[PDB]
């Protein structure tokens with residue numbers, strides 16, 4: 072059994088076959104329906120887990136992700152996700168394969184263009200072939216995910232009790248503003264995935280309000296998600312796996328064997344976590 | 355149990371909203387009016403809709419969530435006339451009563467309320483609503499009534515939910531309220547519910563008990579109700595085997611369609627026969643294997659009736675023990691066998707043939 076959307080996608084033709092497919096994580100049941108491979112390849116993120124204490128070592132855990140964007144890029148580059156306003160230009164879909172573009176327009180409910188292409192394809196041999204069946208199976212998957220819950224049960228409960236304020240931690244950060252109000256607008260698949268991706272900075276329960284970071288790592292965005300600090304210069308993001316200047320004015324640093332002395336000491340990681348506002352919970 | 359003496363039940367579906375008007379200050383003998391009044395509700399949430407200003411008659415009004423105590427539990431509740439008491443849509447038996455006769459105003463007859471002085475002030479709502487299931491939609495919170503008020507006026511396509519902890523009693527209550535308000539509504543809106551629903555079919559059976567309980571004193575409404583799974587799938591198969599101009603077509607459609615033709619053939623459609631057959635209980639009833647519930651079917655001015663098993667004369671036990679019996683000089687095994695041999699020979703058939711002689715009830 073496999074459930075990554077990209078694993079569900081199949082090539083229209085033998086060439087451009089989906090080699091480099093979804094990893095084994097596609098089989099797994101995080102409920103994100105996306106291989107971390109494709110999360111990288113399309114969004115510059117890597118999923119992670121936050122362990123949590125049930126006031127105890129007794130297991131509690133929550134999914135998270137790191138972004139992969141470098142410190143120096145601005146604008147479109149920083150945009151992690153688009154709106155329906157701008158997804159077309161962000162993706163340059165015509166670069167992407169027609170099935171990919173199809174799927175994206177389904178995600179944005181551009182039914183006009185979607186069915187226009189469908190109507191053109193109808194009598195094409197490649198679409199009298201079961202590609203139509205493929206697409207309607209992805210439609211059934213969408214139904215089974217969203218109409219079952221995402222804009223339905225999940226929207227209902229999120230608008231009934233345990234909302235997260237996806238909101239500015241401190242009102243002086245007016246650049247963030249009430250953009251949480253825009254969370255209402257997106258397709259329920261996207262809203263769900265966003266909620267699953269991003270942690271709050273806080274949780275309230277009858278057991279106390281818990282503060283998981285001092286200061287927000289992110290900001291809300293005018294169209295779709297954009298990696299940026301709420302304040303100041305962007306914090307340094309390192310990156311892991313041409314006629315350019317690459318000066319690094321390093322300290323001379325003759326103190327060799329540093330790690331051979333220090334390696335026992337804790338090797339503090341650096342990758343950027345994700346925090347936003349307040350979750351609320353009853354028991 | 356029973357209702358303790360000096361308590362009365364008023365049912366009204368309208369009581370789904372609090373009837374602020376009706377209540378009057380109780381007084382003891384000697385006209386000792388009790389303007390102190392206390393009211394009890396399923397939840398604190400109920401209080402948020404209820405307005406002190408509506409009751410100038412009283413100087414002192416208080417409201418609390420009910421909680422089922424232990425130590426006062428009694429067939430005869432404690433008495434405290436010093437304050438008027440009211441319970442509104444109460445769930446569970448009450449251990450304490452106010453001045454004079456206490457009264458409760460509720461939509462729903464709990465079993466606790468059976469052996470009770472009761473009034474209903476009922477009226478028929480003609481408009482049966484409907485469910486629908488597709489697998490645009492209005493997300494309706496599964497409990498709060500007025501959160502979506504006027505949305506239930508405007509739309510017809512209502513999604514429903516529940517939280518995991520919910521008391522089944524609360525579920526029933528909310529569903530009842532929704533159905534009442536729908537029956538007040540002017541068009542048959544469509545239910546949609548996101549639940550495993552097997553327990554919902556159980557709760558439907560509960561509703562059946564409830565409606566019968568009401569009918570013990572009720573308006574004998576022609577209230578619509580249906581088996582919701584066995585029936586459901588069967589009718590779906592029926593439509594599928596037929597042409598499907600509307601997969602959404604209501605059962606009652608087909609029902610009436612057969613109604614058009616039953617009388618001219620004076621005999622029972624297999625659809626209706628399978629109905630009252632494959633219900634768990636109201637049927638041939640695999641609950642207890644009770645085909646004995648044969649239908650006697652009658653129409654205006656008839657001298658005769660249509661049983662499950664052919665025409666019958668009126669008001670008699672379905673078949674005479676005496677008859678022009680199926681005398682064994684017919685249905686002699688030997689003859690049957692011979693005929694069968696003939697038939698099988700001619701057909702060249704090796705297997706799958708069985709025959710049985712017909713039999714007759716009152717009439718031939």
Ligand SMILES: [Zn+2]
Nearest residue numbers: 077078093106
């Ligand atoms: Zn994938």
